[PDB]
Symmetry: C3
Subunit: 120 residues, 3 copies
């Protein structure tokens, strides 16, 4: 019974509640599908946002996910790095999975494609 | 065994070390008691605070729990969300437990009772 | 099999990329060596920095570690505590290890040496 962190990153086009929730939802949906994540196997989720996002906690998006009511989630501010990607939401989901470490599916969407390791 | 995150949240009325530590201690005490948490089964603890809290690291409250000296804890700044609860301290404790996900008892105290689902 | 957080802390003399990366690398190297950490056993890593560090994400230092390219890592902002250490980088590495809680070797370097828990 092993555990793995699963990362995701995305961006919003503006700091509005609809955009923050929709983009966070889309990122979570991709993490969940690609890693076949059962909510009952999720230890916890962390979600960071850059300090230019104030409209809504990205964690509220989890309310839209059937079966995820009891998955603990909390947020944190991301560092403000010169040249860092603006309006960026990052997920670190801790899942009970037996997949080999190198075979975990980390997800980069929207402008956060630019953070994908192979593009560095 | 399985592992589970346990959430808590509380608030203080002012940014003082006494209030931050007292309220953080009371929140941790409730998490620990209601979930029968032994320190050796705690992987780690994260504690966030809103950016109106500068008085003390909430992690210092662990000094009041005998046997918790070596439980790793680190802090982080919570997002500043318009309309979000002010002076708010949030805990995420990761614990070895076979308790079913829906039976883990998360704890919301003080003005953070408004945050409970 | 048990899981344990391993903490570290260090400081930088200036907010410049190569200083931040080298200090973070040195802290990670010490955590890894002293705890004999196999990357494949690491669930995830968090690295925080105080609000006076803007030059680079400390997490970029992990790219310098052969064998660690699949370890997930992300950053966050540390609280700004009056009397807290300035220019401070902190690590929380979550490792699958059966080592007893009191035997884990948490690492405190540079100006952060007095932050160790039992002090």
């Amino acid at each position: 019974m092993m555990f793995r962190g699963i990362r995701g990153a995305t961006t919003v086009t503006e700091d509005t509640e609809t955009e923050v929730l929709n983009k966070t939802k889309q990122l979570l949906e991709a993490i969940i599908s690609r890693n076949e994540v059962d909510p009952e196997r999720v230890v916890q989720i962390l979600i960071s946002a850059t300090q230019d996002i104030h409209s809504v906690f990205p964690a509220k998006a989890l309310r839209q996910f059937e079966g995820w009511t009891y998955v603990p989630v909390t947020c944190m501010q991301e560092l403000d790095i010169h040249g860092g990607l603006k309006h960026c939401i990052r997920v670190l989901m801790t899942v009970q999975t037996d997949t080999k470490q190198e075979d975990v599916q980390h997800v980069y969407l929207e402008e956060a494609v630019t953070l994908r390791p192979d593009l560095q």
